[PDB]
């Protein structure tokens, strides 16, 4: 199970970023959503999670910085919030065809945590069919169904075990197939140590003045560099 540091360097040289649509946000993220990693976005209502998910659903198909060629996306929807018409508006903004955008996104609803894990096993199988096709896996949201299926106390052991298992599988998916994994999450951020450890990047989203939004690195010092301002339009996330 061991590689030399040289082979791992060769592996990491293929790491890419998927632009969020916002220059400041990308700078905050070091280029955008990073492959071989999980990025978690949490926040309150109308802070940008769904707009960001859809924007990345479009931008992941576009050739980008650092030689990023674009690729396909898998979207797992636990909230019943995915709307292709937003992808149509965003494609219009980015001057790309609607039907082509919609053809490069594979979509599945998850209704239980067991269903979500089965879907992620199918995702792994799909990546296995042909590497290099998919670049992004979106899960909106990462553990709403785990809150749903185990709400009473005393069942926490199995809940935590299943959650850790899912998140270790997500890490392995991201790192074996060189894909970025983007997940949304609710607040009460939930998940505790398990989700804190599993996510490689964590982003808090909040409302700014008027229609602007603010993204921040969670648990980081109160400094401007750890924050970025972005805007939301019919065309998605932007400057």
């Amino acid at each position: 199970g061991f590689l030399t540091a040289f082979e791992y360097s060769e592996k990491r040289k293929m790491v890419f970023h998927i632009t969020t649509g916002s220059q400041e946000f990308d700078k905050l993220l070091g280029g955008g959503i990073e492959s071989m990693a999980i990025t978690e976005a949490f926040g309150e209502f109308r802070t940008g999670k769904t707009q960001l998910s859809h924007t990345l659903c479009v931008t992941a198909q576009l050739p980008g910085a650092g030689g990023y060629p674009g690729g396909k996306i898998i979207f797992i929807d636990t909230e019943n919030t995915f709307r292709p018409d937003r992808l149509r508006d965003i494609a219009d903004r980015f001057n790309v065809d609607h039907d082509a955008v919609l053809d490069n996104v594979l979509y599945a609803r998850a209704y239980t945590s067991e269903h979500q894990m089965e879907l992620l096993d199918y995702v792994a199988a799909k990546f296995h069919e042909e590497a290099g096709i998919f670049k992004l896996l979106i899960i909106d949201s990462i553990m709403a169904l785990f809150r749903v299926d185990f709400s009473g106390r005393g069942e926490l052991a199995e809940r935590q075990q299943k959650l850790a298992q899912m998140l270790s599988r997500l890490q392995k998916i991201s790192e074996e197939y060189n894909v970025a994994v983007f997940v949304t999450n609710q607040m009460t951020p939930i998940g505790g140590h398990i989700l804190a450890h599993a996510s490689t990047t964590r982003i808090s989203l909040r409302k700014g003045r008027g229609e602007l939004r603010i993204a921040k690195i969670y648990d980081s010092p109160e400094m401007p560099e750890n924050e970025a301002t972005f805007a939301i339009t019919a065309g998605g996330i932007g400057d």
Binding site: Q61, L62, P63, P69, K72, A91, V96, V101, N104, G132
Partner: peptide, 4 residues
């Protein structure tokens, strides 16, 4: 892959 073909860009849209």
């Amino acid at each position: 892959f073909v860009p849209p």
